[PDB]
């Protein structure tokens with residue numbers, strides 16, 4: 284019952300989303316996931332999973348604050364982050380300075396390392412799922428419910444993304460189990476996007492052409508990064524988008540290089 288909220292508890296981009304303010308805690312974001320008839324037998328599963336992901340407390344990971352389970356409405360509640368996702372921030376009129384970009388990355392590394400410690404594999408890491416608060420600090424999100432079996436099915440019910448960050452072992456092979464190294468690939472392409480200030484592959488249509496190109500070893504154009512980018516970061520993104528997953532490092536491994544690096548070079 285601890286993660287159960289309801290509409291009467293509440294006063295009242297992104298999508299079909301509404302802002303809200305609960306009594307005790309500060310400001311919150313609410314999204315309605317499903318509208319339709321009551322599945323009922325698939326409710327105990329929804330709450331058990333809602334409390335399982337409520338356990339994920341990290342300053343760089345979005346916390347599920349609660350879930351509204353009413354007659355027809357099924358909704359989720361999360362922490363507020365005012366600057367939006369990382370891309371919208373990167374595409375802004377004012378440029379984000381190097382030192383900020385470095386911290387952002389360190390924050391992404393920490394949050395992914397915490398999730399891998401708890402056993403959660405993100406599956407859909409990208410700039411849309413990196414949320415930014417007022418002081419340019421970040422939290423890792425999952426706006427497409429990729430890590431939440433039951434709630435995603437609830438979203439994709441009868442009665443109710445972008446492949447640029449996906450590891451090539453998952454492209455055209457849907458039956459392969461995502462590993463911790465799958466996120467490491469995605470992280471690499473995020474690193475590109477950060478210093479390129481845009482989505483990769485000229486934001487071109489997700490063709491069979493592009494999929495086979497990536498499976499054969501093509502990557503985002505490093506030459507397209509026109510602003511200054513530290514060599515340590517260029518080395519890391521190339522290391523992390525290696526075709527062979529064994530060649531990619533682990534997020535604990537990444538943090539050990541990068542934390543000492545950020546503090547001296549970038550901060």
Ligand SMILES: CN1C(=O)[C@@H](N2CCc3c(nn(Cc4ccccc4)c3Cl)C2=O)COc2cc(C#N)ccc21
Nearest residue numbers: 297298313314336345346347359360361424425426430
């Ligand atoms: C309101 N809202 C959400 O709460 C949101 N959501 C659920 C809870 C949650 C979230 N990320 N985490 C951290 C995390 C845990 C494991 C793996 C990866 C990350 C946790 Cl835990 C998260 O992004 C889902 O639905 C939305 C969709 C849209 C759109 N479109 C907007 C808002 C929400």
